[PDB]
Amino acid sequence: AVNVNTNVAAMTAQRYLTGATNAQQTSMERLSSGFKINSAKDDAAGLQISNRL
Amino acid sequence: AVNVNTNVAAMTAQRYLTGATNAQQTSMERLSSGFKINSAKDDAAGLQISNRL
């Protein structure tokens, strides 16, 4: 049906809009810094070995 | 991979450039003095037998 209060299409498009935005923010941080690991969230194990190296 | 943070090719060229400079400095010192044993590092037992001769 056609309803005004609920817009499922708007919510879904917004969710995928933020998904793209976060991917763009992490990719832009990687480019400016030149490092693909910046915090433990990128790679926990990789961060530790990279700090030991 | 293409990265800016690490330049292993430049590191290798530096390593072989300092080796060439060290061997060039040793040869220059050898020519000016006219001795191939200007120190103990050049030849230990050669230094002692040459000193005793």
If 0-12 CB within 10 Å is exposed, 13-18 middle and 19+ buried, where does residue A43 land?
Answer: middle
B51 touches chain A (CB under 8 A): no
The alpha carbon of residue B3 is apart from the nearest alpha carbon of chain A, in Å, by 7
A38 touches chain B (CB under 8 A): no
A8 vs A20: CA distance, rounded Å: 19
A20 vs A17: CA distance, rounded Å: 5
Resolution of the determined structure in angstroms stands at: 2.9
Angle of CA points B37, B24, B35, to nearest 5°? 20
Tell me which chain A residues have a C-beta less than 8 angstroms from the C-beta of B5. 34-35
Q: What are phi and psi of A23, to 5 degrees?
A: -65, -35
Q: Residues B22, B30: contact at Cβ < 8 Å?
A: no
Technique used: cryo-EM
Q: Residues B1, A31: contact at Cβ < 8 Å?
A: no
Helix and strand element counts for chain A (H, E): 2, 0
Q: Residues A2, A15: contact at Cβ < 8 Å?
A: no
